[PDB]
């Protein structure tokens, strides 16, 4: 377990992209064993270790295991990503090199957060208050006592309340609602197709509405066919809002509901 729900290391950048992490490693000299930590953009509660070696960047996913420990795939578990980084500063233990030099956040640069991370604590507070009828200290104690389970639940449901999620509406309703108003390129929504985690991404491109399939594979991972895999729709939306990555264009303005 981390000491707090949020990471606070001086070399943690929050939810920067692979590309932003690489830009920071170049800014820091791309010296062998230069590294930073970012929040995983496709593994819930996960991190990514971005380290320079051979004037190349190497990126490792650090998963949160079921017991609240952290591990790169097939590696020893660690209490926290802080412990993982300090350990890999002493033993390579499978990494391309020893971690030698943390690249720290430049002065006054804060860890990046997404829409979900900015809503998360308040969504959990509202859920415990309304489910259990609690106030003040009692509310605060209840949040803390089940923090890990509450974080998993709010993550799985938070999309329902977000502006781009229109629930169970038809293909036809989606084309109609996307084509209302300014035909801003990248205007988008996500709709449900069934109750079994199948969805569609509806995207405005040169006055035409495209539909991409979003499917839950047998692991519980959401993806567009041949696309990056995510634990949540809010992760998927954050990714395709940064770069097209196979879409005809990047997602921009969420289509307003009615």
């Amino acid at each position: 377990s981390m000491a707090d729900s949020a990471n606070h290391l001086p070399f943690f950048f929050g939810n920067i992209t692979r590309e932003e992490a690489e830009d920071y490693l170049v800014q820091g000299g791309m010296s062998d064993g230069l590294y930073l930590l970012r929040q995983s953009r496709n593994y819930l509660g996960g991190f990514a270790l971005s380290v320079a070696h051979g004037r190349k960047a190497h990126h490792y996913t650090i998963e949160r295991e079921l017991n609240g420990t952290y591990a790169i795939a097939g590696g020893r578990t660690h209490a926290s990503p802080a412990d993982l980084c300090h350990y890999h500063s002493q033993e390579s233990d499978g990494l391309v090199c020893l971690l030698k030099k943390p690249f720290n956040r430049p002065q006054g640069v804060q860890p990046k957060t997404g829409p979900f991370e900015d809503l998360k604590e308040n969504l959990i507070r509202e859920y415990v208050k309304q489910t259990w009828n609690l106030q003040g200290q009692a509310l605060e104690q209840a949040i803390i006592s089940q923090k890990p389970q509450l974080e998993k639940l709010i993550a799985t449901t938070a999309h329902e309340k977000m502006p781009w999620f229109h629930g169970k509406i038809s293909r036809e309703e989606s084309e109609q609602i996307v084509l209302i108003g300014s035909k801003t390129n990248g205007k988008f929504l996500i709709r449900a197709r069934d109750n079994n985690g199948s969805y569609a991404l509806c995207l405005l491109h040169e006055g035409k509405v495209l539909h991409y399939r979003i499917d839950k594979d047998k692991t519980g991972k959401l993806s567009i066919p041949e696309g990056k895999k995510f634990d949540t729709l809010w992760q998927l939306v954050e990714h395709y809002s940064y770069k097209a990555d196979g879409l005809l264009r990047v997602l921009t303005v969420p289509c307003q509901k009615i």
Partner: peptide, 19 residues
């Protein structure tokens, strides 16, 4: 075609523990 296919997804290689 009714659902758009993805075009050429960018290279996005994750490193693994090795040696």
């Amino acid at each position: 075609q009714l659902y758009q296919p993805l075009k050429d997804r960018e290279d996005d290689q994750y490193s693994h523990l090795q040696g």
